[PDB]
Design a protein around this ligand. Structure first.
Ligand SMILES: COc1ccc(COc2ccc(Cn3cnc4cc(C(=O)N5CC6(COC6)C5)cnc43)cc2OC)cn1
Length: 282
């Protein structure tokens, strides 16, 4: 509404890089990595917290530095919310850019479902918490563009947080990211208007959230099982093909996924409508 995506960075986030003790790496991409670390004296409470630090790798420059900066500026304007991976601080002077975020000890939702015991209440909680996080991003005018279980983290209490590995995801070597022109795109998660027109809105995040609901209630099957991404798959999604209901999905949840897969983006529900319906279902 009142703010576009052009604001500079808020120095209030700055944290002294010498109070960071790096630990194990948590994941890496072509130009970025995410490392565990301990922050020594972070915030008002002077905590010594385990954190995750996003940073560029040995080999990058130019737009890569900018893209991390842009990631940092984007997160500094969201603010804090329980159901996202929140920014805690950053080091932008005296060295390479470091983006300090919450550490989610249980890892990503997808491997959690695959490692699994769960319950029907546990899947509805995951679905609702992700929906709250997406509603918060929506209300900030922020288009996620990679909504999927591999980008949802579980932290203490097995509370779900939506985030994005961004530069720290090895996209070049992940078959879920399809070669399409000069881009690697998570086609199986993507709204048709976004695959074809490269149109990305809140409503296209809603489609991807429906795919994410299917992942949750299948306990982490790959979407469109057995169906390879090619021209025929594109014709299927455009013609209105929808995956069948997951075995553990109550009919009410499946109806949410179908509403999310409306071919007309205005006919999908908003994230707040999904929160309220998930809310009543409890
Ligand atoms: C909508 O816009 C937004 C919103 C938010 C964001 C920021 O998102 C992120 C920021 C930082 C990280 C890094 N990050 C933190 N905790 C993590 C735990 C693991 C793990 O695998 N774990 C825990 C373990 C126990 O052994 C170690 C196994 C991996 N990486 C971890 C991940 C992010 O997103 C998923 C971006 N864009």
């Amino acid at each position: 509404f009142i703010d576009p995506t052009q604001l500079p960075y808020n120095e209030k986030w700055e944290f002294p890089r010498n109070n960071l003790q790096f630990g194990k790496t948590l994941g890496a991409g072509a130009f970025g990595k995410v490392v565990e670390a301990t922050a020594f004296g972070l915030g008002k409470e002077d905590a010594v917290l385990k954190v995750a630090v996003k940073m560029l790798k040995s080999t990058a420059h130019a737009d890569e530095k900018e893209a991390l900066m842009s990631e940092l500026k984007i997160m500094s304007h969201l603010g804090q919310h329980e159901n996202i991976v929140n920014l805690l601080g950053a080091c932008t002077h005296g060295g390479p850019v470091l983006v300090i975020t919450e550490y989610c000890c249980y890892g990503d939702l997808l491997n959690f479902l695959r490692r699994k015991q769960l319950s029907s209440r546990d899947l509805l909680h995951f679905s609702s918490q992700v929906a709250q996080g997406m509603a918060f991003l929506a209300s900030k005018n922020c288009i996620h563009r990679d909504v999927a279980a591999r980008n949802v983290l579980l932290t203490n209490g097995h509370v779900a947080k939506i985030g994005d590995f961004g530069l720290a995801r090895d996209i070049m070597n992940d078959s879920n990211y399809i070669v399409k022109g000069n881009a690697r795109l998570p086609v199986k998660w993507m709204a048709p208007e976004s695959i074809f027109d490269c149109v990305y809105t809140v409503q296209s995040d809603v489609w991807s959230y429906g795919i994410l609901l299917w992942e949750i209630f299948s306990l982490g099957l790959n979407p469109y099982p057995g169906i390879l991404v090619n021209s025929k798959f594109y014709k299927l999604v455009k013609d209105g093909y929808q995956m069948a209901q997951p075995a553990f999905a109550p009919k009410n949840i499946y109806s949410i996924m179908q509403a999310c897969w409306a071919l007309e983006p205005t006919h999908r529900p908003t994230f707040q409508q999904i929160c309220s319906f998930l809310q009543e279902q409890a």
